[PDB]
Amino acid sequence: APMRGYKVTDNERTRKYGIGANSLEMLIAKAKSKFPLLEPHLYLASDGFEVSDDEYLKSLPAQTLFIVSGPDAVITTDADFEFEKM
Amino acid sequence: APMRGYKVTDNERTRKYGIGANSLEMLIAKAKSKFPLLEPHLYLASDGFEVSDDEYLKSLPAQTLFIVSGPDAVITTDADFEFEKML
Amino acid sequence: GAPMRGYKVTDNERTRKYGIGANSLEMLIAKAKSKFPLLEPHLYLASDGFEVSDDEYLKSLPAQTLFIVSGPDAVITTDADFEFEKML
Amino acid sequence: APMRGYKVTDNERTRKYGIGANSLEMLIAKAKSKFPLLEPHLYLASDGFEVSDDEYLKSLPAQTLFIVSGPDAVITTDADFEFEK
Amino acid sequence: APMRGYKVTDNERTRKYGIGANSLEMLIAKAKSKFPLLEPHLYLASDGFEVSDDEYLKSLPAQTLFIVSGPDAVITTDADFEFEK
Amino acid sequence: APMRGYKVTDNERTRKYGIGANSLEMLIAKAKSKFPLLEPHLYLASDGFEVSDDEYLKSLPAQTLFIVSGPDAVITTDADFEFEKM
Amino acid sequence: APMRGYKVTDNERTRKYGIGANSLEMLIAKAKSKFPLLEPHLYLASDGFEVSDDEYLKSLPAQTLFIVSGPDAVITTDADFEFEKM
Amino acid sequence: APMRGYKVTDNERTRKYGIGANSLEMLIAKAKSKFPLLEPHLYLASDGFEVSDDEYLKSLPAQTLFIVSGPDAVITTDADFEFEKM
Amino acid sequence: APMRGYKVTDNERTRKYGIGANSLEMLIAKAKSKFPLLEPHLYLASDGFEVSDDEYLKSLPAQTLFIVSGPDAVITTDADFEFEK
Amino acid sequence: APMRGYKVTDNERTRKYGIGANSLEMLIAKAKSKFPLLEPHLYLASDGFEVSDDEYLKSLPAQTLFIVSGPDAVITTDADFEFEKM
Numbered sequence: 123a124p125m126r127g128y129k130v131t132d133n134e135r136t137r138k139y140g141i142g143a144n145s146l147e148m149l150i151a152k153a154k155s156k157f158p159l160l161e162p163h164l165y166l167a168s169d170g171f172e173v174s175d176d177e178y179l180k181s182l183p184a185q186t187l188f189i190v191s192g193p194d195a196v197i198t199t200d201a202d203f204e205f206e207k208m
Numbered sequence: 209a210p211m212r213g214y215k216v217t218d219n220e221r222t223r224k225y226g227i228g229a230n231s232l233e234m235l236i237a238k239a240k241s242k243f244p245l246l247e248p249h250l251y252l253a254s255d256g257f258e259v260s261d262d263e264y265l266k267s268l269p270a271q272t273l274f275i276v277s278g279p280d281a282v283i284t285t286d287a288d289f290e291f292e293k294m295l
Numbered sequence: 296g297a298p299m300r301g302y303k304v305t306d307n308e309r310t311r312k313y314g315i316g317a318n319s320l321e322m323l324i325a326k327a328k329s330k331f332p333l334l335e336p337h338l339y340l341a342s343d344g345f346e347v348s349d350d351e352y353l354k355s356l357p358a359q360t361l362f363i364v365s366g367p368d369a370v371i372t373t374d375a376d377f378e379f380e381k382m383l
Numbered sequence: 384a385p386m387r388g389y390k391v392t393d394n395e396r397t398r399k400y401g402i403g404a405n406s407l408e409m410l411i412a413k414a415k416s417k418f419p420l421l422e423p424h425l426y427l428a429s430d431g432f433e434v435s436d437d438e439y440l441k442s443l444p445a446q447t448l449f450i451v452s453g454p455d456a457v458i459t460t461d462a463d464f465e466f467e468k
Numbered sequence: 469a470p471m472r473g474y475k476v477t478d479n480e481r482t483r484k485y486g487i488g489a490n491s492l493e494m495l496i497a498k499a500k501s502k503f504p505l506l507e508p509h510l511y512l513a514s515d516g517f518e519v520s521d522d523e524y525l526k527s528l529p530a531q532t533l534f535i536v537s538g539p540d541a542v543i544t545t546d547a548d549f550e551f552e553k
Numbered sequence: 554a555p556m557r558g559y560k561v562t563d564n565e566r567t568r569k570y571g572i573g574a575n576s577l578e579m580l581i582a583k584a585k586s587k588f589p590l591l592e593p594h595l596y597l598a599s600d601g602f603e604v605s606d607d608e609y610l611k612s613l614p615a616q617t618l619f620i621v622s623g624p625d626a627v628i629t630t631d632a633d634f635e636f637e638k639m
Numbered sequence: 640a641p642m643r644g645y646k647v648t649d650n651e652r653t654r655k656y657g658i659g660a661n662s663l664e665m666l667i668a669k670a671k672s673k674f675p676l677l678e679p680h681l682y683l684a685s686d687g688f689e690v691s692d693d694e695y696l697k698s699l700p701a702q703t704l705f706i707v708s709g710p711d712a713v714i715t716t717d718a719d720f721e722f723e724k725m
Numbered sequence: 726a727p728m729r730g731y732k733v734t735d736n737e738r739t740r741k742y743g744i745g746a747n748s749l750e751m752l753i754a755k756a757k758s759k760f761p762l763l764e765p766h767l768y769l770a771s772d773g774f775e776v777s778d779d780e781y782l783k784s785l786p787a788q789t790l791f792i793v794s795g796p797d798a799v800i801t802t803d804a805d806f807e808f809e810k811m
Numbered sequence: 812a813p814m815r816g817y818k819v820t821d822n823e824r825t826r827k828y829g830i831g832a833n834s835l836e837m838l839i840a841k842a843k844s845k846f847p848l849l850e851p852h853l854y855l856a857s858d859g860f861e862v863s864d865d866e867y868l869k870s871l872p873a874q875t876l877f878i879v880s881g882p883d884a885v886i887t888t889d890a891d892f893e894f895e896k
Numbered sequence: 897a898p899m900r901g902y903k904v905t906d907n908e909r910t911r912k913y914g915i916g917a918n919s920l921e922m923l924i925a926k927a928k929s930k931f932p933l934l935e936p937h938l939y940l941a942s943d944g945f946e947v948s949d950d951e952y953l954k955s956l957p958a959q960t961l962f963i964v965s966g967p968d969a970v971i972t973t974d975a976d977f978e979f980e981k982m
Contacts, residue, residue: 557698558699570695571688571690571695573696
């Protein structure tokens with residue numbers, strides 16, 4: 123498995139990290155080491171879908187932005203977060 | 209068979225998952241474990257058509273959005289979903 | 296040697312709607328029949344109602360074109376008239 | 384020769400078929416089999432002009448609608464057919 | 469293993485250096501000797517994300533511009549830094 | 554080990570030399586010998602970054618144009634030198 | 640060590656010779672015999688840069704066009720020499 | 726030492742011969758016997774540069790096209806010749 | 812000293828022969844016997860240059876096509892000969 | 897001296913034989929034995945050139961295809977013969 127770069131942030135978009143990971147578990151592990159989460163879940167910042175499998179993750183292009191969040195927490199999408207603080 | 213990413217939701221747009229799958233069989237299995245449906249069928253969110261065979265699935269572009277629902281189900285299409293909540 | 300492509304099929308009153316992969320007009324017709332009550336089924340463009348008469352005319356068409364499936368030599372409700380007679 | 388799709392009907396708009404054909408001859412044969420017509424000829428539904436050779440046929444854009452009818456027949460053009468109705 | 473070139477600057481973009489480095493460790497070490505910082509961290513000037521791993525660094529193309537700053541420093545992005553100008 | 558050709562000028566585009574060098578040290582030596590400065594520093598004419606180590610130098614493509622100037626100096630980049638001159 | 644071919648001209652582009660040379664010294668020698676200059680120096684027609692050492696010369700691809708001219712003479716680069724001819 | 730084939734013509738491209746030669750001198754001799762010039766010099770049809778020494782000649786690829794002309798001669802380049810024919 | 816094969820034709824491309832020869836003398840001699848011309852000269856079909864020495868000939872790859880013609884006839888080159896057709 | 901294998905056919909490629917021959921004479925003889933021609937001559941199927949000399953025959957690689965034909969016959973080349981087939 124090849125290591126790929128991803129951008130991860132919290133739902134309020136305050137901490138922002140780039141992470142190398144060749145699996146959805148490596149990415150989730152690394153995400154939590156850096157985050158106050160009990161069980162962290164990755165969501166596409168674009169539309170908010172949960173990255174559920176390693177397979178759906180490698181579907182995604184490199185440097186895709188994820189929100190890391192609660193287990194079935196609902197995400198402020200990028201369109202909505204950008205629009206809320208204007 | 210090549211694994212591709214598809215987006216799946218229930219008709220009420222509450223649970224939203226990305227799923228890797230190389231067959232319509234694998235995709236249906238994975239959706240079933242994540243969804244409260246007995247035997248589940250895939251529908252295009254666009255127009256409400258049923259993905260009936262695996263052949264039609266790889267016809268569709270990756271990251272296509274599906275509604276998952278019961279057999280012989282009529283779907284609130286995306287156009288009709290948006291307009292009725294804005295209402 | 297024939298490429299599998301995706302088409303969209305419905306009955307004349309738009310209740311059962313399926314997408315079907317098929318590389319021939321006979322493969323599409325077979326699959327349409329398993330999902331439908333009609334005993335000998337024929338494909339019609341939802342647009343204008345023309346019968347897809349041979350396999351070559353089927354590959355003439357772009358993918359995901361919508362067909363009405365119906366009985367032989369039967370005239371179909373065009374999309375325009377179905378979707379305006381519907382709102383009437 | 385490339386196979387292309389064309390639209391054929393009678394002068395009365397009763398029978399409507401899509402036909403694949405790489406020649407005006409292949410198209411004429413295929414219309415022949417689906418029609419009760421002795422020696423049948425193709426006309427532009429638009430203008431009523433007879434498609435006289437294979438070359439003028441491949442001049443035309445795909446999915447052009449033709450009236451098929453007897454030779455030297457004068458056609459109810461599309462404007463006149465649907466104005467009569 | 470392979471030494472690659474990166475461009476590093478401070479948050480007010482006054483001290484600009486190109487640095488060869490085959491690890492995020494080496495890049496950080498060399499960055500610290502040329503910069504007035506205690507524990508220094510690399511961030512993409514583009515969007516401001518923190519370069520967390522050696523792996524995420526080697527994800528990036530060569531001559532990528534980094535801001536080096538404090539541990540949870542929030543950075544004036546290139547877009548915002550050149551707009552204030 | 555390998556000799557490569559680089560292009561050197563002062564911040565005023567007066568003297569222009571091509572110099573072969575297998576190190577940033579050799580290049581700096583040869584730069585000073587042709588220049589007035591007491592201790593010389595190399596900068597990318599493109600964006601003005603200082604070539605800090607021999608390793609970053611070999612990062613660069615051959616025949617890259619450098620400015621030589623003092624350790625202090627901030628440089629009129631190529632974009633700005635030929636924007637202001639015109 | 641290896642003989643290579645170079646193209647040399649004066650700054651007004653009247654006398655044009657191809658010269659075989661494995662050193663910047665051999666090249667400059669041969670240029671001097673064919674030119675009225677006492678101590679002549681080579682410049683890239685492309686850039687106007689002085690080929691300052693033997694090493695930078697072998698940096699260059701064969702059949703590179705050089706101007707031979709005064710010691711610190713500045714050259715009408717061919718881009719501008721060809722621009723003035725119109 | 727090794728014989729190579731070169732292609733030679735006059736400036737008006739009326740007479741065209743292929744000539745084997747291992748030196749610029751042998752080539753110059755053979756063109757001399759085939760051409761109405763008193764002291765003949767070789768020029769690249771491409772650029773119009775004078776092949777000045779034997780070394781610059783073996784720089785060149787085989788079957789390179791040369792013009793023969795008088796000393797200090799300016800040549801109709803191939804671009805300029807086959808353009809001005811129309 | 813080594814015998815090699817070449818292709819010879821007249822300026823018309825009507826008579827076409829393959830000829831084995833280790834010298835420009837042997838080659839033109841053999842063309843002499845198979846062609847009318849009293850003093851025949853070899854020219855490259857490609858560009859029309861006269862093969863002037865035995866040396867320029869062994870420069871050429873085997874099975875190179877020559878026009879054989881008059882002492883200073885100018886050749887319809889292959890580009891032009893097959894364009895007139 | 898060394899026997900080599902060649903391939904022979906008539907101008908409409910209906911009778912096809914492989915023939916061993918160490919001379920153009922032997923090849924021509926054996927071909928005439930199998931063919932309805934009085935004095936027969938060999939032509940390259942590829943090019944249509946007459947294999948006029950024994951040395952030119954040994955110039956060619958083994959299994960080159962020949963047309964056997966009349967003394968000054970012009971041949972349907974392989975390119976032209978197999979386009980007439982369409």
